[PDB]
Design a protein around this ligand. Structure first.
Ligand SMILES: *[C@@H]1O[C@H](CO[C@@H]2O[C@@H](C)[C@@H](O)[C@@H](O)[C@@H]2O)[C@@H](O[C@@H]2O[C@H](CO)[C@@H](O[C@@H]3O[C@H](CO)[C@@H](O)[C@H](O)[C@@H]3O)[C@H](O)[C@H]2NC(C)=O)[C@H](O)[C@H]1NC(C)=O
Lengths: 211, 185, 221, 123, 217, 211
């Protein structure tokens, strides 16, 4: 019944910088804290156990400290292979509760997205379904807002978003939004628009087409 | 008439771990203990209460042979009035002991190249063992105040610890097979 | 150190049960706890339960009690977790990990899970294998084009462009779980718009579970 | 319980020597006497054992015929007659005791230790 | 289930080291005791030695001065090394798991490996000379395969069209170190002047293929 | 140190018969004994251990019975899969030793051999060596005696024998004996004879030729 709270959930840092992650417990857990590192598609790996010990093979740049209810994982010099998700776990008693996990991402300059839209193909229309795709490419930071409008009417509950990870070349994100409508509903409307809001964009950008 | 099955005890292939030491009652048979004492395979042969050479003369109701494996350094603990992990939490001999303690090195049989983890010894217990008492429970030991809900954690330790037996260990860390004859009359 | 190997992926239906194996390479079996940790997609880790094989039974968190059973086969050095009464919220990777618990003399030092299994992706759904319908995201008024891979199951779908000759500017978004229970993803690539009428762009959609391979030539309408 | 050890010295290879170990504070004969030699850089290693209650000597293989141990009941003293000495025998000799009838190669099994004596075998 | 596969050179010059390695699949090499059993061709079984999982070995008294066994836990395999081999050390070497009985010296062997063949000779590859065993006064005829090394030699008649009554004896070891065998077949004597009998001798190690037409002299 | 002698060395019995093999030890070995089945060209197979215990998977017709210095192996109903060689191993010492080996075979009616002889070819005589081949075909049982005579003089130490297994069709044996002489020795003699003795032959059969 002991919970762990991490902070922040997602920080941006460049190579060689200093990274500080805090993990706080609801009640005292002595020194039974661990830190795990997980990279995408792989199992988590231990970094700190006992709140202050380094696992064998861990680079010395990682350092942990604290006891009781306040703990801290510190990375002295960030490395290109140190961008991952870090979880703090308390081993004090069941359930060994993992923290929310903090994702360390490659800090970089602000970049604006490029916007694209795609009308559904005639082949799909023959099947009786219409899907409208809105594309956001190469933007940073990750926080972005997408709004769908059909005949200038705002849509809700009929669209989904999907975002890629940081690009290996320029550390940007790409996002795609899909609007799904039946052919009858699709033929009952003419104008479909997608609105994009991002920090790197001075004004919202809209792409639209006519059926 | 019948010969005491001492071959099945001293020469058995497998010896029990010390925490779950195996006791084999022996009765209704005749054995020669003098040749046992003069054997050369027994590095340690202590008899308390009765001299080794007089064993074949006196008659006893029952003879128990407790056999197990311990480290070399822990052999001194198998004796009356001793203290340590083995003499407290695994195998305790009574103060008024009447019998013999036999031990010999078994590094060739009970070691593994990567470490032999089939031999375990109890590491914690809520109280010292009474003489000739076996405890095979594996309940999590609560060393603090909070209840251990069957889960290892802070102040909650698993009582059984396994010897790491390797052929390269020093003499004090090599397995020793111990047989403790206890004469009851 | 010790090496842990798990079983393969599973696909189940709500209300059924799934048994996942975890074979320990060996080294301290029957006295080392084998903990089971699950991770929902895009969520945090979560500890299910632990077993120490010599105990025979298994202890569980106060969230999986009554529907998780952990057992150990000492002879085969394998640990089995059986999660019964599956639901939609049990779609996750299930790791098996080994406990260490170094304690000096007062409480200093704790447990950690040093070896982990590769993970056993367990998916709960209500749909069988289905071929993907590939529709062209034809470029129209750099140029962006792609192929919408819609209504397939289960994951994954691999997409390449011009038989792998085109890799730069290619983005394959993660699959999303539609309300119908089928997965859907898009893959797009940015190419110079000046060469649309001369270059051929064909997306190589490969859905191995349904053995569907569609080479759709993406051309302007 | 007190052990007095004496008789050591210097001797040439192939010689003989006699060590004396007297046990005082023993109420009865139910005890054993052992001899341990500590080579420089080596742990103590037993070489001979005598169960007083049985008068049953025992020797390690390396000195099986070169050493002879016996007890004289008049003075309650145990004598270790060392013959055919070799330079391998240069070590400090201790005599121990224990309230048991038998033998044990672990020095920690013996509770009473006399002060050691030095024996050097060289030419 | 434990499975054992031998490996090692099949040809060893005299007064050299016979190095064999048994790869264990299905379990760790340190979970059981292992042994080596050899069998000279056409003779009884013989035990070489066994090694415990602690690395302590017991050796056959007759071979105690030439046998060395060890464990390679990294590759999950154990090996045998026999030095100063002679013509009496050619045999089939089996690597077995050593089951343990009631007392600590009680051992029996199961499961056995397939078994490798090791030959101690002093001659390189040589092609066989094919001499016709021509039919003369049912009819018996054949071809003599003499002075070849190493085994085996495969013989077929009329490109395999003749199989009935064909007897290919096991090869014999001549004092020169070369092998020799004879292959015979019984055919009706009435058709010697009309049927063509050609022995297809094939010695793959020397790449020798001789089609010798067996005709009456 | 402990010798094991099996008797009989060779045993012939038809299918369904009761077969008894005896292993005898020079010193008492308690119940410490095992039996192995060796089919030609394959690895031995454990059958019985500890005197009478039956290995898992072995058919129940195999029975072991004995203690001390004498042991027996009994096959209740001999079958085609039970024609092989059987070894007894003792394990009452640090020197594990096997037995001589007992070979069991498909018993059949007595059959007489056919005898053939071959003079050396002219091609081989050019090479300077002469080989004389004596052929024994399709006889049973295996026990047979072959003698070589050159110019009516008995030969010894210059001939070798080779015998095939039981034939798959008539369960008979085939044997070949080869006499080797140099061309100079070959041209110093004229008459070469091969004598065959077998149980199925009433009188020895001799084949000969002249150079
Ligand atoms: C535990 O086992 C040992 C060893 O057993 C011996 O060696 C095994 C490899 C097998 O071959 C066994 O069959 C064999 O007995 C027993 O120690 C042995 O005891 C016997 C007597 O029972 C000793 O034989 C003696 O040999 C001397 C000559 O050296 C004769 O003068 C004696 O009359 C007698 O025959 C044998 O030497 C001894 N082995 C060793 C290495 O000391 C041991 O007895 C047994 N345990 C028990 C409780 O019986």
């Amino acid at each position: 019944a002991i919970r762990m709270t991490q902070s922040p959930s997602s920080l941006s840092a460049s190579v060689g910088d200093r990274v500080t992650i805090t993990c706080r417990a609801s009640q005292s857990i002595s020194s039974y804290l661990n830190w795990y590192q997980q990279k995408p598609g792989k199992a988590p790996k231990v970094l700190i156990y006992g709140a202050s010990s380094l696992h064998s093979g861990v680079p010395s740049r990682f350092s942990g400290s604290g006891s009781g209810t306040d703990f801290t994982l510190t990375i002295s010099r960030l490395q290109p292979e140190d961008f991952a998700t870090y979880y703090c776990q308390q081993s004090h008693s069941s359930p060994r509760s993992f923290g929310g996990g903090t994702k360390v991402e490659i800090k970089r300059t602000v970049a604006a997205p490029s916007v694209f839209i795609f009308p559904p193909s005639d082949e799909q229309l023959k099947s009786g379904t219409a899907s409208v795709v809105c594309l956001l490419n190469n933007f940073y930071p990750r926080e972005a807002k997408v709004q769908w409008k059909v005949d200038n009417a705002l849509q809700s509950g009929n669209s989904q978003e999907s975002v890629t990870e940081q690009d290996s070349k320029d550390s940007t994100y790409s996002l795609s939004s899909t609007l799904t409508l039946s052919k009858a509903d699709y033929e009952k409307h003419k104008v479909y628009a997608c609105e994009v809001t991002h920090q790197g964009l001075s004004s919202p950008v809209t792409k639209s087409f006519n059926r | 008439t019948n010969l005491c099955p001492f071959g099945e005890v001293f020469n058995a292939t497998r010896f029990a771990s010390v925490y779950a030491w195996n006791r084999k009652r022996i009765s209704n048979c005749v054995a020669d203990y003098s040749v046992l004492y003069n054997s050369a395979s027994f590095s340690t042969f202590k008899c308390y209460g009765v001299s080794p050479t007089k064993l074949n003369d006196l008659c006893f109701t029952n003879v128990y042979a407790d056999s197990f494996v311990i480290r070399g350094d822990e052999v001194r603990q198998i004796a009356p009035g001793q203290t340590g992990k083995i003499a407290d939490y695994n195998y305790k001999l009574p103060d008024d002991f009447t019998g013999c303690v036999i031990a010999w090195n078994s590094n060739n049989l009970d070691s593994k190249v990567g470490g032999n983890y089939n031999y375990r010894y109890r590491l914690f217990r809520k109280s010292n063992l009474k003489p000739f008492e076996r405890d095979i429970s594996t309940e999590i030991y609560q060393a603090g105040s909070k209840p251990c809900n069957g889960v290892e954690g802070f102040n909650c330790y698993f009582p059984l610890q396994s010897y790491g037996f390797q052929p390269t260990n020093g003499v004090g860390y090599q397995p020793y097979r111990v047989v403790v004859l206890s004469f009851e009359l | 150190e010790v090496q842990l190997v798990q079983s393969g992926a599973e696909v189940k239906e709500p209300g059924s049960s799934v048994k996942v194996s975890c074979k320990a390479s060996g080294g301290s079996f029957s006295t080392s706890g084998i903990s089971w940790v699950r991770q929902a997609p895009g969520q945090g880790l979560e500890w299910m339960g632990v077993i120490i094989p010599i105990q025979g039974t298994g202890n569980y968190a106060q969230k999986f009690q009554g529907r998780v059973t952990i057992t150990a086969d000492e002879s085969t050095t394998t640990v089995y977790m059986e999660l019964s009464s599956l639901r939609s919220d049990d779609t996750a990777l299930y790791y098996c990990a080994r406990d260490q618990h170094i304690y000096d003399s007062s409480g200093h030092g704790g447990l950690w899970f040093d070896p982990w299994g590769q993970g056993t992706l367990v998916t709960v759904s209500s749909a069988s294998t289905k071929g993907p319908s590939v529709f062209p995201l034809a470029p129209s008024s750099t140029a962006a084009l792609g192929c919408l891979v819609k209504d397939y199951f289960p994951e994954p779908v691999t997409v390449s462009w011009n038989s792998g000759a085109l890799t730069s500017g290619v983005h394959t978004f993660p699959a999303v779980l539609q309300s119908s229970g089928l997965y859907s993803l898009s893959s797009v690539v940015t190419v110079p718009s000046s060469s649309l009428g001369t270059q051929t762009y064909i997306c190589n959609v490969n859905h191995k579970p349904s053995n569907t391979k569609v080479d759709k030539r993406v051309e302007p309408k | 319980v007190q052990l007095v050890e004496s008789g050591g010295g210097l001797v040439q290879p192939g010689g003989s020597l006699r060590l004396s170990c007297a046990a005082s504070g023993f109420t009865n004969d139910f005890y054993s006497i052992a001899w341990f030699r500590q080579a420089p850089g080596k742990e103590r290693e037993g070489v001979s054992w005598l169960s007083v209650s049985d008068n049953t000597p025992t020797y390690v293989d390396s000195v099986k015929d070169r050493f002879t141990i016996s007890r004289h009941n008049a003075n309650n003293t145990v004598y270790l007659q060392m013959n055919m000495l070799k330079p391998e025998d240069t070590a400090i000799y201790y005599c121990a005791a224990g309230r048991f009838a038998g033998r044990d190669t672990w020095p920690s099994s013996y509770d009473y230790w006399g002060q050691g004596t030095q024996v050097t075998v060289s030419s």
